[PDB]
Amino acid sequence: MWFEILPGLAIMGVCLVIPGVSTAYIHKFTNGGKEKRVARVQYQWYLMERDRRISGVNRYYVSKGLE
């Protein structure tokens, strides 16, 4: 019947979720489990950069009250 148009769709869907799940986990892996900071405006880039300088070289590492 119409049962059969589903096979094809399944392979479309599966190929349209990969991208959204992929981009959203290759970010939380590269950024240390914390969402990649979105620096829309400079202030944010400043804060981000400030973070880099604060520790290691990468901003994702985040020092706390114990420092």
């Binding site: 990649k36 985040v62 706390k64 009250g65």
Partner: protein, 142 residues
Amino acid sequence: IVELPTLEELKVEEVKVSSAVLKAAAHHYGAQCDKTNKEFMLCRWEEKDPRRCLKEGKLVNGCALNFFRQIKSHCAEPFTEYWTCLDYSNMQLFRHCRQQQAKFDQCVLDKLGWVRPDLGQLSKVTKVKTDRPLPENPYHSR
């Protein structure tokens, strides 16, 4: 020449904590330590040069470090939980973390006695009477 100040003149303890840490305590720091900062601002504005307010800047930093030492000593755990959750978010938005914020805010009210400043009441202009001489002829007007 340029009369650039010397390093020893500009070496002072550093806050160095992740920006996230600050944003979480931002409100309280805007509260417990705006006396010196406002004065420093006054100097840095009327007196355009930075060299003319360096010492004030040192005072600016000193005020915050202890601000942190107090929190480290008391209600450190709450603050630790609040910043970690705040840091995970990409724009470190305040509303994703309100449950952690409440426990951090309530505790320091309970122990430190400080208070989270209500919506606003930080943006409003402040009057600080810097005993420094209100400068004149700035920009070596000639």
